[PDB]
Structure formats: structure tokens, C-alpha cells
């Protein structure tokens, strides 16, 4: 996260850290959507141009965390992966279309002050909240500048109109993506960055006061560049696939 700030304790209890065992390192962000399911970007698990192809046993999920590196005794829960499900139509060769994956945990995690799932949007929530100019919030332990934090970072950013998103890049944008960030002339700055993918773009519903995950940090070109915008997987667009996986498995 570039130009964000330290998150407050328990501010993003659905934040999950995808962790590589060997060597030990943070791979990506992710989110808790039930006591047994974690949502993330598929490129965090499969990306052949970077020789990336993780199997369940190469990974661990750490939930309830604040510090990037210290083991938070009795606060965080470390879970193993029973199964990974990548969207069948995830297009890594061209534009990361449908950059989304579900991970079923071996054992359900107990919720606590620091661990709780985020809501997934339904059609009314998506229609009402996903509008250009409305702000969502992005969290992550990714890089602080284009090329790092001691604790989880947070940044609020406005959803951008689709024509503007399209004209800001030569990468082919699809309806399974949306972009967010301040315009070349809005004064403010901020963006997600490498290391943040899988992390949630959330919005607080003014109708029922709950946080909803509308997006997943997916890609960008550099970080926080003037005129560029971060891109996010459109969670509601792929919700039928999310629900079919959860219902079935």
C-alpha cells in the first residue's frame, strides 16, 4: 500500500496473509469470507510467466494479524490449506481476467475480536455501492512504494468511471474488473502495490453498516503513478462461481 497509513487493531479482521513456507515470506493478501473459506487473487497461486504454481502444501494462511513479521501469540491463527480452487476461466496469459481463487481451510477458524469474515455483495449491494466517485478501502502488507511496512497498511480510494479506467492502460479491461484511485488532478494519492494482491477492496454499506468485499487487489502498472489506477477483480461479477464452489465443496 502506497501512501496509506497504519491500520488500527481489529480494523480489518477479515484480512488474511498468504504465506510461503520455504523460504518463509509473505506472498500476498487474502480475505476471510467464512470460518472455512479464504478468497484471494488467482495470480497469487498461479502465474506461469513467474514460474508460479502453488500447491496446498507450499502454503499457509495467517489470520488475525497486525504486525507483518512477528508471530502474534494467541491472537493470530495459522491454518493449512485443504484445497485450492482457481477460476476455470482465469486468463493469466492476457490480462488476469477473473483473477480470483478460493482456498478451503483444513479446519474452521474460530472468530474473535481480531478475526471475522467480511460480507460478500449481492445484486442490490453491488448496484448501490459500486459507483464511480464512491470510496472503498484497501489493506495489505505489500510494498510502500513502487519497486515494507511493519504493520498492516490501509488506504481509502475512489472508484473510477469505466471509460477512464479503459483509457488509462493498453491492457484490455473487462467487466470482471474495476479500477480505483485519484485522478491526475484530484490532489490526493494512494494505491495498492506489489505484495497487496488478494487483499480486499471493501466498502461500508450506509444501509446496514456492514463491510462488503467488492473487489480483490489484482494488478496495476507501477504503483501510485499519476494518471494510472489500480485494478481489482469485480467480486459480484464472479459471485455465482464463488457460491457454486462453496456450495459444492
Amino acid at each position: 500500500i502506497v501512501e496509506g497509513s497504519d491500520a488500527e487493531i481489529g480494523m480489518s479482521p477479515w484480512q488474511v496473509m498468504l504465506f510461503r513456507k520455504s523460504p518463509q515470506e509473505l506472498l500476498c493478501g487474502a480475505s476471510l469470507i467464512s470460518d472455512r473459506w479464504v478468497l484471494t487473487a488467482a495470480h497469487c497461486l498461479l502465474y506461469p510467466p513467474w514460474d508460479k504454481n502453488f500447491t496446498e502444501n507450499d502454503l499457509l494462511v495467517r489470520i488475525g494479524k497486525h504486525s507483518r513479521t512477528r508471530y502474534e501469540r494467541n491472537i493470530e491463527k495459522i491454518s493449512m490449506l485443504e484445497k485450492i480452487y482457481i477460476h476455470p476461466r482465469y486468463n493469466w496469459r492476457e490480462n488476469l481476467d477473473r483473477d480470483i481463487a478460493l482456498m478451503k481451510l483444513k479446519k474452521p477458524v474460530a472468530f474473535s475480536d481480531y478475526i471475522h469474515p467480511v460480507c460478500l455483495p449481492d445484486r442490490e449491494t453491488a448496484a448501490s455501492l459500486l459507483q464511480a466517485g464512491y470510496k472503498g478501502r484497501v489493506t495489505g502488507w505489500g510494498n510502500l512504494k513502487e519497486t515494507q511496512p511493519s504493520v498492516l497498511q490501509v488506504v481509502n480510494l475512489p472508484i473510477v468511471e469505466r471509460p477512464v479506467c479503459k483509457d488509462s492502460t493498453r491492457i484490455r479491461i473487462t467487466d470482471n474488473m474495476f479500477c480505483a484511485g485519484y485522478k491526475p488532478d484530484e490532489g490526493k494519492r494512494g494505491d495498492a502495490c506489489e505484495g497487496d494482491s488478494g487483499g480486499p477492496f471493501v466498502m461500508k454499506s450506509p444501509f446496514n453498516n456492514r463491510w462488503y468485499q467488492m473487489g480483490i487487489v489484482s494488478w496495476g502498472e507501477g504503483c501510485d503513478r499519476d494518471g494510472k489506477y489500480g485494478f481489482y477483480t469485480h467480486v459480484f461479477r464472479l459471485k455465482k462461481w464463488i457460491q457454486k464452489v462453496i456450495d459444492q465443496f
Binding site: 488500527e8 487493531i9 480494523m11 475480536d113 490501509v154
Partner: peptide, 27 residues
């Protein structure tokens, strides 16, 4: 269901330091 409500914030009727910026963006 039990999702999207934070024990240390909404449950205690406390706001985190910047959620207000989000709410204002709706208006």
C-alpha cells in the same frame, strides 16, 4: 449472517479513524 461487523468497532459503537471519509463519499 455474522459478517462485516467488527467486534472492536461496530459492535462497540466506535468508528475507526477514517471510515467517515467513506461515508461522505456517498454524499
Amino acid at each position: 449472517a455474522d459478517c462485516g461487523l467488527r467486534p472492536l468497532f461496530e459492535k462497540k459503537s466506535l468508528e475507526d479513524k477514517t471510515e467517515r471519509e467513506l461515508l461522505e463519499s456517498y454524499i
